[PDB]
Write a structure and sequence with these properties.
alpha/beta; Rossmann fold; Luciferase, domain 3; five-stranded antiparallel beta sheet; 30% helix; 25% strand; binds adenosine monophosphate; binds chloride ion; ligase; Adenylation domain
């Protein structure tokens, strides 16, 4: 039994199926002028999951996804999880050679795409199975849940990232971190089925996975923001306002361009990926609940939060806060010795959100995902981030070691 309760023993798609059973007629997903209910979304994913099972998708199958941000991309993701596999979202705007390297590194034998992306799949020369989902004839297939065997330690998704230099690498994420996040978001952000959540991040990026499941594992609605909507700050404000969106996660670099008087309905603004200035926090923290979230691809996108304390004077600095439920974080020196208040060292993260490691990168995995000496038999991730404890028990982010 976990320190903080969550839906232990459950896969991502099982938690989604429970929401589709409880809230069948609520709106699940919106893109432009189209929307699906939970029941509609679940049925379509089950029809596709049975097709993918017939093609050989099984536990720890890595299934490439080369698709636009769309309702059909979400159907594909849910279908891969229900068939028992794991998906790798491939950024279709990347140069050809980067897509080629990712597909080759991943060793994926099956890629899901759409008609508008088929020519790119041909041009990067992929020689495995290609499923053109908007040519697939699925309407006759059974719409019931599959109930395939699954364990929360099974792979769910693989996210590729490239450093300044270094080859793209795949971070392997299991279901368990996203199951814990469902509990975290309900407890700490009060997410309910009433919420209307924007999908901002590229569906290549680990943050997108977090955003998508923030909605779909609570019965809330997910509004997939279009390229045009994100590109124009006025259009972005109008879209949020007209659709009464209640929660969004943004890079602070984007939030900087927005006008609080132009967003009607948000109850929470989360910023992630980089630091928010104190002036940016002061501009927003009395209009809504401002949350600074610190987390990594390697930790299921989550580690710590700092919600700006409500009804307070201005702040002159912006902590990254405290570890979230069922996660551990340590500030250590180069010898992995714990540091007292005020001493800067490396953030190391442990607990349920930790990736399995890097795909086919055993020495890098061993270097980064080290034995947790504080909790025998667990691992912890060496972030490369510098931080210190404040004596109030919050963490200050200081940059890179
Ligand atoms: N709230 C934050 N404040 C400052 N840096 C952050 C924050 N959240 C994420 N980061 C940085 O982004 C990295 C994770 O990048 P990624 O895995 O691409 O999400 C972390 O190791 C930090 O360097
Ligand atoms: Cl089940």
């Amino acid at each position: 039994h976990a320190l903080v309760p969550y839906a232990q023993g459950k896969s991502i798609h099982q938690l989604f199926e429970e929401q589709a059973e409880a809230f069948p007629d609520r709106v699940a997903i919106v893109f432009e002028n189209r929307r699906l209910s939970y029941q509609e979304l679940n049925r379509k994913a089950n029809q596709l999951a049975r097709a993918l099972l017939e093609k050989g998708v099984q536990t720890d199958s890595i299934v490439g996804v080369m698709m636009e941000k769309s309702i059909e991309n979400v159907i594909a993701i849910l279908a891969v999880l229900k068939a028992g596999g794991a998906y790798v979202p491939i950024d279709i705007e990347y140069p050809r050679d980067r897509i080629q390297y990712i597909l080759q590194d991943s060793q994926t034998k099956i890629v899901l795409t759409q008609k508008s992306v088929s020519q790119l799949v041909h041009d990067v020369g992929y020689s495995g199975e290609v499923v053109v989902l908007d040519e697939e004839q699925l309407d006759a297939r059974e719409t019931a849940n599959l109930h395939q065997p699954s364990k929360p330690t099974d792979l769910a998704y693989v996210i590729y990232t490239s450093g300044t230099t270094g080859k793209p690498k795949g971070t392997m994420l299991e279901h368990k971190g996203i199951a814990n996040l469902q509990s975290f978001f309900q407890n700490s952000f009060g997410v309910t089925e009433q919420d209307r959540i924007g999908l901002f991040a590229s569906m290549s990026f680990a943050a997108s996975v977090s955003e998508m499941f923030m909605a779909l594992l609570s019965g809330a609605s997910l509004y997939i923001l279009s390229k045009q909507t994100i590109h124009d700050f006025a259009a972005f404000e109008h879209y949020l306002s007209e659709n009464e969106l209640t929660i969004i996660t943004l890079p602070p670099t984007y939030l900087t361009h927005l006008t609080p008087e132009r967003i009607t309905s948000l109850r929470i603004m989360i910023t992630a990926g980089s630091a928010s200035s104190a002036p940016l926090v002061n501009k927003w923290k009395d209009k809504l609940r401002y949350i600074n979230a610190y987390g990594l691809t390697e930790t299921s996108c989550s580690a710590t939060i700092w919600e700006a304390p409500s009804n307070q004077l201005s702040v002159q600095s912006v902590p990254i806060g405290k570890p979230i439920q069922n996660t551990h974080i340590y500030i250590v020196n180069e010898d992995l010795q714990l540091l007292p208040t005020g001493s800067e060292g490396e953030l190391c993260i442990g607990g349920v959100g930790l990736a399995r490691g890097y795909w086919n990168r055993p020495d890098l995995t061993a270097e980064k995902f080290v034995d947790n000496p504080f909790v025998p038999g667990e691992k912890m991730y060496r972030t490369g981030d510098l931080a210190k404890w404040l004596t109030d028990g919050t963490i200050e982010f200081l940059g890179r070691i």
